[PDB]
Ligand binder design. Sequence first.
Ligand SMILES: Nc1ncnc2c1ncn2[C@@H]1O[C@H](COP(=O)(O)OP(=O)(O)OP(O)(O)=S)[C@@H](O)[C@H]1O
Ligand SMILES: Nc1ncnc2c1ncn2[C@@H]1O[C@H](COP(=O)(O)OP(=O)(O)OP(O)(O)=S)[C@@H](O)[C@H]1O
Ligand SMILES: [Mg+2]
Ligand SMILES: [Mg+2]
Lengths: 429, 190, 92, 71, 87, 401
Amino acid sequence: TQRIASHSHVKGLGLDESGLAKQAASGLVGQENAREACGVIVELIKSKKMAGRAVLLAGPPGTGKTALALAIAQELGSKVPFCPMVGSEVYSTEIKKTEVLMENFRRAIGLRIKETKEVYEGEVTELTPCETENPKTISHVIIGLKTAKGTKQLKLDPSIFESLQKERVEAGDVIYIEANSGAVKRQGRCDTYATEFDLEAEEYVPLPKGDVHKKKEIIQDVTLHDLDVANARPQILSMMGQLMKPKKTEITDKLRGEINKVVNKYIDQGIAELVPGVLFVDEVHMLDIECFTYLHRALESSIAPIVIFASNRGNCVIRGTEDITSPHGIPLDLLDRVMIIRTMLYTPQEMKQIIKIRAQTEGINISEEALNHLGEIGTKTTLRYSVQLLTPANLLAKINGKDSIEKEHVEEISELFYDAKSSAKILAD
Amino acid sequence: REVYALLYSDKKDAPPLLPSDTGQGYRTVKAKLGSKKVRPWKWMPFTNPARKDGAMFFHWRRAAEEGKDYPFARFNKTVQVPVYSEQEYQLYLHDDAWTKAETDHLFDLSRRFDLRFVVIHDRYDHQQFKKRSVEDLKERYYHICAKLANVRIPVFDAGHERRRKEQLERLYNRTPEQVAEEEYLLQELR
Amino acid sequence: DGPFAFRRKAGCQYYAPHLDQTGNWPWTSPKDGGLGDVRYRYCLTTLTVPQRCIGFARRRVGRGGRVLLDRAHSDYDSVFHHLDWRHFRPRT
Amino acid sequence: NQVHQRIAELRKAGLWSQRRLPKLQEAPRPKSHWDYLLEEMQWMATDFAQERRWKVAAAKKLVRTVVRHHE
Amino acid sequence: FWNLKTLQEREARLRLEQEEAELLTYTREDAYSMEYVYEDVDGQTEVMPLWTPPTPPQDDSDIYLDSVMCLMYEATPIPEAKLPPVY
Amino acid sequence: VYGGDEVGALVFDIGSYTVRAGYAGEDCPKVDFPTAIGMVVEPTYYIDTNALRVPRENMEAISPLKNGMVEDWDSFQAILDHTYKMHVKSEASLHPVLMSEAPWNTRAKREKLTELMFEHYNIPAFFLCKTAVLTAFANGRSTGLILDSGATHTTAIPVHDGYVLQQGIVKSPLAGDFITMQCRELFQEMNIELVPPYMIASKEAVREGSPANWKRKEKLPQVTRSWHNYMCNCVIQDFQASVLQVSDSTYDEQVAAQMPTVHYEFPNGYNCDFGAERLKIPEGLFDPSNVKTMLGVSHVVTTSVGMCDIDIRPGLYGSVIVAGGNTLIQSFTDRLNRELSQKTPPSMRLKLIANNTTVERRFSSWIGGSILASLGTFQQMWISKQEYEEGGKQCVERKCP
Ligand SMILES: Nc1ncnc2c1ncn2[C@@H]1O[C@H](COP(=O)(O)OP(=O)(O)OP(O)(O)=S)[C@@H](O)[C@H]1O
Ligand SMILES: Nc1ncnc2c1ncn2[C@@H]1O[C@H](COP(=O)(O)OP(=O)(O)OP(O)(O)=S)[C@@H](O)[C@H]1O
Ligand SMILES: [Mg+2]
Ligand SMILES: [Mg+2]
């Protein structure tokens, strides 16, 4: 939140109601066609109808592919699970690459659980059994519960007498009794009986506020991967497992099918609602041929999330092949399964707009001539480079007692720091 | 949504909540009550400086408060009414319509009843002096006050007040047919 | 207008008559034509002990300096008891 | 119409209450001792009524509690 | 049937216990130590009015108001903008 | 500044029926004994209920008050002395006294009362306020139309800003005594022999309409006709309280006959169902034209207001206060409110103050007196004995408005 990252200014796709892209809105400038295609992808995600649809962001470095993916993430909100990955992460030492891929697929499927609990909580004021003649016999056990709002008497089933003595409930104890099971749980002496002279900690609790009888709704957000991990290794075998290192395991398809069954049962019961989301794979050209081939099968699943790939490699040899060059480092078979969104280079004006928006987000005052100089630096060199000059030039200005960057500060910082091309020039000489 | 009332709002109103300690039991507030002791109260005579006679009534008050100035005496201040000499009347205030003793009676009543001219009119000695309307009393009083102020401000308009009261009387005395007529006009002209 | 026409005189001010709604005493609602002077008003009040809305109340000083809560009956008093509009709550 | 003439004739007669005359402002004055007396009287009368209501209700409460104590 | 009868007799007794007055007294802290406030949707705060005995006058700012006059006329002088010109 | 100051003052409200007395600050008179007293020509005075109800030879029943004003100052002194010694149990020179007075009390009578209170009882301070103002003060209202119907008069008294507008006082003779006379006539028509309870040694249960089976007390001394009439009046007033009812609208014979009868038992065991005549009797208070030019209570109200300033009539109609014992007849308040709402101008709001109980109706003047005497701001108003030294004639009329 508070610290400023390279994309901290991206607040979403600047689209209108008609789906057309504004020239500069929501922190994004240009890329209008790419932003409109990303908006159509957002509509695809929100439709929740489709599974395994793939889209490739493709274009030169620094054309906003990652910015566009994080803009899709901003548009979808915090409810939709958005799982970032980079292709270097598949090469784990604990598990095989295709397991890493499947785990990240299941991280992008969200499930929202809804629990509705009915509870009778209060300080115990009486525990009188109700004697009777059997057609000593008791037909009820009366419990009086007090809260800050008031007091209620309950006519509980006599069998609750076992749980009352098991919990060692006495007058002056805060307890709660759930409607469904009827089992009592004790949560301490009411703090109105605590003195400052006696020493106990866990055994005191404040008198409950609210009505004695309460209906609680508990909403929990989980992923299918969370359920997978939970059912794969539940938390003396526990002692050895916790002493030893808990490595990642190659979760079997059997468990995934069982969890699919359980989640479908929950969705039928109304307890849960699915929120399928997005897996973002940046630097996807770091995947090898085994990963791309597996992804063929992975994207054809009816359970898969929507996946967003990004590449900049151009016509490059596929990792793990020999001499198999591919249009993006991505084999043509996988490219036939993805829709491609092209990203294009920026004009000097678009670069100046991006530089200004970055200076605004970094909290930097930049003069007009300094902005023009930094824009022309960015038309040389790169956009990224010119943006990186903002804060060191601001610091140099603060040293010289200036509240705004002047052109001389940009010049001096440019003389101190060099880009990749100038350094290649120095290396060549 | 809210309720307004003076004394109480309805017969079914719940009783007021009075403050008191020991409502949560005496035992829990035992140490606080035992730690302190009450200040002494006295049945004591008090001077009321609003009274001109100097009579002494009695109070329940704390011992340290004995002899302190009576606080309710601060309320005592009368409505400002001018006073004129026989000479000032002879010079300025003479009116062939009004006797001097009649004007002095009017001003004494005004000082008695704080310019509540309905009460002055009720208490006005219509038997001894001439019969006066409340507009006549207001006219004479405000005329004299204005003249004395000028010799040593919204002026009164007797005619406007007379017309206002006459109109109100006419609107009041009309028969039920004559108010049914007006309400039927008010509802049909809409 | 004629015999009852309004004639302004210099250095004078006038109070307009009540026409839209008949007037009423200060201790009565503005919906009932009153001035609604707030010292008479009862509003929903919550106590600290018990932590429950006692319904419509007004703070009034008593004879001995004792601050008293007067309480007004309402048909929805039970709903206000279950409750947890202008609704006053005490604070330090 | 005829209703307009009826209204005009009432207004001529003064009997048209929609056009009542205003009230000339009395000269302003501060509150006298009697005004403060009547304010304090209204406050004391309120306190009397509420105290009587409280005593009646409290007596009823205590006696019904005693009767329950015997029962 | 005996249990149904006894539960109806119990509900009758509880109704009798509840018809009787619930509250007669409130704490000193609520009475004096804590002021009563209300906060609206805009964050503006209102303090609950306290009906106190009349306060002594410091100056002549305590202008008298005729409560019976206010039954027929409103308490504010007519503004000069809507006042008809001098006759 | 603060709450009202209590200076230990006494509040006396001596009406024609009962003498209401007590200490200021209380919400109810601690004593109310009948105003009628026993007199034996020597005179020996028997004043309170314990003494009045026992037969005595040559003892007459008299009242110090006549037309709402005290006539016999000896009996007035006797009542005051009895009140002090028996009920007050404190010296008269120790407590300030605030007494009520009739709306129409004469100046000479006020001077005589003040002279008695200061010379004889040696009280430290005194004040004399009107019953109507105190009735208004009991209700927290500084202005309004008091309607008082005791045993002697039915009176409308307009109060404005705590002052009785004496010009607007309208008084009618129809009151509790008129109802007592009407019940006497009804009993005479039905040939019921009114046997006061003091003459009954024993009685036996009899059916309705059956002749009374009662045994007369023996060794009974001769009694004056006044005392016998007073005892008969007592039983008739019990009947008035127990049986009579005001019709919710103008009395109709058929509707009255439809409504259920009410059973009353006389002291001698005689009992009867009183049918529709129980509604006819109170109708004289509202429609005197049917009684075998008096004004009805609603006409007394509407006449009294018409004599006040039309600036104040909105307030008078906006605060109607009903007081007096005779207003406790069943449905009297409802009928009065209905008639006033029917007769009131639509342009003015009419509201009858809702206090309808025995304490609030009969003791209202005493309650207002206690409220007034408990005010700190009122402590300026007292007439002191030092003031009586100079203005014994001058200030007594000027200090109490
Ligand atoms: N249209 C744009 N509007 C605003 N900021 C942008 C835009 N395009 C890029 N940026 C920012 O400029 C930087 C470069 O964009 P990136 O998303 O990093 O490019 P990229 O396509 O991911 O380059 P590669 O392929 O990962 S090396 C980031 O800090 C972006 O937030
Ligand atoms: N509960 C009652 N129901 C009906 N009549 C009643 C009731 N109580 C008293 N009365 C009658 O009311 C009359 C007395 O009323 P009060 O106002 O107390 O008289 P008083 O004020 O002492 O003397 P006056 O006439 O006002 S100077 C008698 O005629 C009683 O019979
Ligand atoms: Mg990137
Ligand atoms: Mg009386």
